[PDB]
Structures are given as structure tokens and as C-alpha cells.
Design a protein around this nucleic acid. Sequence first.
DNA 1: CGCGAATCGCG
DNA 2: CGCGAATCGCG
Length: 134
Amino acid sequence: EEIIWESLSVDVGSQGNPGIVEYKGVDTKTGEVLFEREPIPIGTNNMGEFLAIVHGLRYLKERNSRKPIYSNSQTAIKWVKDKKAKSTLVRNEETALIWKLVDEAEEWLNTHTYETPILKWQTDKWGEIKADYG
DNA sequence: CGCGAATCGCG
DNA sequence: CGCGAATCGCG
Ligand SMILES: [Mg+2]
């Protein structure tokens, strides 16, 4: 399997797990930042990776793009394909925002179709995913 | 730490 | 038993 350069790559920047979560989607070839989510005060890295893929799906659908999405998160890929984010993070006032976003992302997946292939980025083969926060 | 996958205890 | 609940490997 080889890299598809004409694609979008996503990744999360965490400050702790759980902790502050941000993410972005970038052009795999050029590194152009296509979308970003500002820091969410608490969430898990998995939740952020799930949100990043769904945001990518929404972005690509709006643009009618057929580009695939790369994620380095096998867990988040599974959650998206299952249309169910199996997170164990407690639901309280503190975690209300991340859960609101996850619930809405699930709702989007359950009420839309999409053409975008969702592919696993192979870090051991290909090095850092282009959206890495470093 | 949080995950999915793989590996006890009570009814 | 056998079955859900509770407890390695990675990133
Ligand atoms: Mg990540």
C-alpha cells in the first residue's frame, strides 16, 4: 500500500490525556492548513481524533471533494465507521463541551452519507502524519 | 492516561 | 461449567 498524496491528513494536539484537545486538517502534500479546532478545555485524545475525522468528512463533503482522509488513530477510524464514539470519559459540567461535539459528530454521521475513504496513516512506514503538532 | 483486543467470579 | 464483568499493547 502506498501514500495517496492528494489527500487530507488530521491529527490532535493534546495537553494531557485527558486534557486540552485541539485538532487540525492539512493538505497531505502541501501542508496547507484547511481547518482547525481551537482548544477544547478537556477531552481525550481519542475523542479529538474522532472529531477531527468527522470535521474532515464535513469539510470535504461541503467542497464536493473525493480526496481521502488519513488518520493515525485506529480507534477513531473504528468509531467513525461504527458511527459510535465508544469513549469512557465521564459526562459532567467540565466535559460538557467535548461531549456536545462528539454527540453532534455522531448525529452528523447518522444523518449523512459520504464518499470519502478513511485511511490509516502508517507512521512506522511513512514517518510523521502531516498534521502532527510536533 | 484511553482505547480495542485478549485474557474472573457468581449464578 | 458458561457468560458477562473486570482486568496487554500500544500511542
Ligand atoms: Mg494523534
